[PDB]
Amino acid sequence: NGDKMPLKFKLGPLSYQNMAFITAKDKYKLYPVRIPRLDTSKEFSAYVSGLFEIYRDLGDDRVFNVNSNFAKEHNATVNLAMEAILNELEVFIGRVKDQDGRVNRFYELEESLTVLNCLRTMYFILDGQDVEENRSEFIESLLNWINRSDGEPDEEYIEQVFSVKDSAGKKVFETQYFWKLLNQLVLRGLLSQAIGCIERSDLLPYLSDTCAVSFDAVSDSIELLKQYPKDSSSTFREWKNLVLKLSQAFGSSATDISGELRDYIEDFLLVIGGNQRKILQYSRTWYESFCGFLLYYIPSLELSAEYLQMSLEANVVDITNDWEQPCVDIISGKIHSILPVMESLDSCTAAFTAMICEAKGLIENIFEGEKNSDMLEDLFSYRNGMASYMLNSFAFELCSLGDKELWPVAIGLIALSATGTRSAKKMVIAELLPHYPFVTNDDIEWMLSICVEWRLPEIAKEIYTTLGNQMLSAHN
Amino acid sequence: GAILVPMTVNDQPIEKNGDKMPLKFKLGPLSYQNMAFITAKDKYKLYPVRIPRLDTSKEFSAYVSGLFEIYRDLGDDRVFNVVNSNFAKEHNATVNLAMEAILNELEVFIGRVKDQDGRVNRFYELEESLTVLNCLRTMYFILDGQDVEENRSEFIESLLNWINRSDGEPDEEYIEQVFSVKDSTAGKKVFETQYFWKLLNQLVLRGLLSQAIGCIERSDLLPYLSDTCAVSFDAVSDSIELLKQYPKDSSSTFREWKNLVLKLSQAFGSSATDISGELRDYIEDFLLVIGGNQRKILQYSRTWYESFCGFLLYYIPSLELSAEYLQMSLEANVVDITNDWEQPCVDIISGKIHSILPVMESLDSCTAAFTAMICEAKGLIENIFEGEKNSMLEDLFSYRNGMASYMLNSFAFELCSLGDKELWPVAIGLIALSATGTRSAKKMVIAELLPHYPFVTNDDIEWMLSICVEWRLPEIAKEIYTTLGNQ
Amino acid sequence: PHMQPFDSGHDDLVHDVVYDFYGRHVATCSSDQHIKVFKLDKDTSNWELSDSWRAHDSSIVAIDWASPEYGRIIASASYDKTVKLWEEDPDQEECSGRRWNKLCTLNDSKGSLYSVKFAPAHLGLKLACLGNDGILRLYDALEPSDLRSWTLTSEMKVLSIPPANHLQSDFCLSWCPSRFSPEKLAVSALEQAIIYQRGKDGKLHVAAKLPGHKSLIRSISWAPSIGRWYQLIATGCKDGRIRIFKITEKNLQVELLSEHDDHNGEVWSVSWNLTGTILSSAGDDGKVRLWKATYSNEFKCMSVIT
């Protein structure tokens, strides 16, 4: 294998068709190579088109102005576009699972979505306000984000402990395993399932018989779970009340149960009441803690800073997956640093994500580099935004994809770029357009209409010169 | 994570794993006077204990008074409104100045502390606290969201200052360390040691150009070079010339400066090699670093902040790239957990300011309090919390209001147990000016604190009363009085 | 995702493979003195030989396509001291060996030729070549109608005295693609690498050099500067390093942006994107690396094919 040979590689005009070869004796094969992790699927271009529509439709609102309703109405539409983006991506992920299965691309797209769910939950619902401003929407997004990030508790683990595997004479729920999985369910808002795992073993059994006192706790506790408030921050204020009353009553009362079963029920009640110490104890990952704190302790984003800190002291960020850290960054205020990671999962999603974050005004162009200026074409630099940068890159990337359907997206993206001289753009289009993969008459007319719209005379003149030889002699 | 203080180092009561003894402790009305004791046979000593890391010094109360003055003087500007066109510009004007005032008061304090005891654990912490503050000013209290071109002079000055006060190196105790003139290798010239260069680049990366030049005029400027290779003598010489005029006021002059530098590195790049194979490169690298080669600026950087600093000085002086600069810098050298200031600075630079407060609160409660305050004034942190369906819940001292309001109010309460009547006005003023909380909520808090004021003079008493008047707590005045007769 | 490799049909080693403007065609040249052209069938996404033919008396080393706005034209450089130009005659069966007619021959070179590159279309049919004689030559098809009317536009001595020993020599060319930038081209000759620019006097002058190479420069290519104001040219040296130079004209400034030895051995091929967005490098390690630029303008390896 280790023969030092002269390998040569040439990138082709088409992303999906490059070439490798070797200048050595008895090595006369040509190896067509396509760029690693490239999306050629129809599902993808649909996604791209879908996202471009939202971008185009955002109109003046894709920009953020650093009449009292313009503020409120602006967020209204931006927050909706965010939902649109999320939707388009779910659909995409869907069509990908059906077509190719749970491949490497599927995993990355979900990760990309998880980071987006988290982003929406934190900045595209409350608009800087607190959970009381809209308890329903918030908790919904939160509970959704959490239960789509990872699979656990996977039902393949539910049966794992209900294995009915009796090996020091287990009482089916006197096991520490049972409870952790009950609290876990609660911490994740998965109350329905939580209730089920209880009505599974000793609701009426060991309890309705052994200790009639604790039977009442474990029962009307399940009752409170059944009505955890998700719309009125008032109803919650009163909910946490009955819960704290319950934990106190039971706290000092008739102990007609095992020494362990005694506590295993207090803890269950403590967690539901919001005991910080406990919510951390039965949390497997930082995000279970973070989620719990908001659900059972105090539902205020003014404490997220603290919640996140405590959560991470309990369970560190798991570097296995690429989404956890970006979420930690989102929650902790530094949004800008999720872009590099998302750009790795999918260039497209990252591009538009950065875009809508600029629309919301969560990231802006801090740049200012001249008092002496007037050629410095920079449509593609750090001079303008971090968003402008990412959108423009995506445009260029689309040009080598060779899909004539997306070329309009590419050019449109460049044309609508909220930054850069009309002349700077003119030049960029002047160089890209000639590469448009036209075939139809309608295709050619499109090229021309763009030469008109931008006044690229000497370019419509070459398109036609290629045409004088591929249009005056081709469509024969 | 906690401070394990030595109650009374000389004579400790608990020693044997034996009879786990019943230790009892009672916090006193005075921070500096608490008490520990034991309910056991032949343990009849009382141990007066003062709260770990408490500042009783006069230097400290001066500091506190100084900071309270700036806070009070900030007037309406200590608040941030989320005269029309200028209120914005004029607001930053004053806030940015107050930031300078705060920094000043802390330098003075650190000064009076070095003279008093010298270099006590307290001195180290206060410097750390200042380093984090220098960094904070350099990034948010100069350019007001703009880029370095907006004010190249001030910025680079603050940056260069922040960097050269964070750590001591290169300490002159290390300068001589390599200029030992040790020739333990056949002809070890005065620089042919990578050691010499690293310390030259280091100086450059830190803007320490004066020193940088000196280390050159130390060994082979004219020596090995003016003789051996006349070509490279000209590079190393007029390079030192450019260093002498590194622009610090015009972002124009810099644009042209980096020009001559890049011209120089290109000319030399492909030219007469009449020097050693190594000395050849050691000079290119020196020229690459000055030109801003990213690859190189990282190579000769010992700590992330040397890289970060270099990038801004020699590559592109734009804060729009700090995000990238910081990332590359940290890939090269991780954050050093030895000292408490590095991470907070990384946080500042990277946008999450709020998370420096917990750490600064550990170095010094006071500084942290006012730091949080001015950050709110700038509008760098705000109260995200909110109310209910327009409906008690008047717990001033909570997470309900700001993170700043919280820290200021805590500091106020902490001052009350200090027993220094000089600071009591600060304590009450801090509470009274708290930009959040009902006039009635405050009334109650003052109603409970005031009775503890350590009055002695007539003027002291008149002050207490004037506050009972100002807040309408006449019943409380009639109470401190009931202590006079029966005192 | 690797695709089904295929045989070129060459007996002796293959030197260069080049894409047409649209990326749907490829031209191959080897030592067996043949030039093969492959077509990418629309229907069955396979590469299939369009035509092969003997074109030189010696080993063919370089090749290149002209802009489509001048027709279907390929140019070849061989060790037989010549450069030949061909034009496809659509009225011939593919694989007939007679689908490409020689339009001309350039014999001015007195030493073998290592490279030939057409110039950017916005300058007309123009081209350059460099060989052992160490003399770069530019040719112009003055009258775009007579694709035989190839005049010699310029001659420059890259090496003052061409060493001429143990043919342990290398030369490369690459024009600046830029449409809105003054005519200029890069040239590598052994350890040196220099840039030429058209003057107001219509003559080429040396405008700069890309310093730092400590061995033979195996490859160099100017990147498409779409969007940017500056220029970027990369070089794959024998000392095992990829180098990327930022060239600004305020006349020309020269910055070195990145250096990469990830290959640990000689970098044989260095290539660019159509947008100059991705840069490729291949070498001894038998690996191809793709590089993207950071936001700071540094370059990062976004993938490694093997």
Curated annotation (Swiss-Prot), chain A:
The gene is NUP85. This is Nucleoporin NUP85. Present with 7920 molecules/cell in log phase SD medium. The chain holds residues 61 to 551 of 744 of the full protein. It is found in: Nucleus, Nuclear pore complex; Nucleus membrane. Keywords: Membrane, mRNA transport, Nuclear pore complex, Nucleus, Protein transport, Translocation, Transport. It is a peripheral membrane protein. One of its GO terms (cellular component) is nuclear membrane. Component of the nuclear pore complex (NPC). NPC constitutes the exclusive means of nucleocytoplasmic transport. NPCs allow the passive diffusion of ions and small molecules and the active, nuclear transport receptor-mediated bidirectional transport of macromolecules such as proteins, RNAs, ribonucleoparticles (RNPs), and ribosomal subunits across the nuclear envelope. Due to its 8-fold rotational symmetry, all subunits are present with 8 copies or multiples thereof. GO terms for biological process: mRNA export from nucleus; nuclear pore localization; nucleocytoplasmic transport; positive regulation of DNA-templated transcription; protein import into nucleus; ribosomal large subunit export from nucleus. One of its GO terms (molecular function) is structural constituent of nuclear pore. It comes from Saccharomyces cerevisiae (strain ATCC 204508 / S288c). Belongs to the nucleoporin Nup85 family. Functions as a component of the nuclear pore complex (NPC). NPC components, collectively referred to as nucleoporins (NUPs), can play the role of both NPC structural components and of docking or interaction partners for transiently associated nuclear transport factors. NUP85 is involved in nuclear poly(A)+ RNA and pre-ribosome export, in GSP1 nuclear import, in NPC assembly and distribution, as well as in nuclear envelope organization.
From Swiss-Prot, chain C:
It is a peripheral membrane protein. InterPro entries: Sec13/Seh1_fam, WD40/YVTN_repeat-like_dom_sf, WD40_repeat_dom_sf, WD40_rpt. WD repeats lie at residues 9-48, 55-96, 108-149, 155-194, 212-250, 262-301. This is Nucleoporin SEH1. The keyword Nucleus applies. Belongs to the WD repeat SEC13 family. Present with 952 molecules/cell in log phase SD medium. One of its GO terms (biological process) is positive regulation of TORC1 signaling. The keyword Protein transport applies. Disulfide bonds: none annotated. SMART domains: WD40. Keywords: Membrane, mRNA transport, Nuclear pore complex, Nucleus, Phosphoprotein, Protein transport, Repeat, Translocation, Transport, Vacuole, WD repeat. Its main location: nucleus.
